[PDB]
Amino acid sequence: KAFERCELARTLKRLGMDGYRGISLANWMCLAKWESGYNTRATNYNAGDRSTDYGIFQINSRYWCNDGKTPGAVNAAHLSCSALLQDNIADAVAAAKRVVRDPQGIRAWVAWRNRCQNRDVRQYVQGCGV
CATH number reported for the structural domain that contains residue 19 in this entry: 1.10.530.10
Active site residue 35: yes
Q: Tell me the backbone φ, ψ of residue 51, rounded to 5 degrees.
A: -110, 170
| Residue 45: CB atoms within 10 Å | 11
Three-state secondary-structure class, residue 11 = helix
In single-letter form, the type of residue at position 5 comes to: R
Catalytic residue selected from 4, 18, 35, 49:
35
84: containing domain: 1-130
DSSP-derived secondary structure for 18-61: TTBTTB-HHHHHHHHHHHHTTBTT-EEEETTTTEEEETTTTEET
Count of domains observed in the chain: 1
Please tell me the distance from the alpha carbon of residue 117 to that of residue 3, in angstroms, as a whole number.
23
Resolution of this entry, Å: 1.8
E-strand ranges in 39-130 read 43-46, 51-54, 59-60, 65-66, 79-80
Contacts of 38 (CB under 8 A, 6+ apart): 2, 3, 4, 5, 8, 32, 56
| Residue 105: CB atoms within 10 Å | 16
In single-letter form, the type of residue at position 13 comes to: K
Catalytic residue selected from 7, 53, 91, 120:
53
Active site residue 53: yes
C-alpha of 48 from chain center: 21
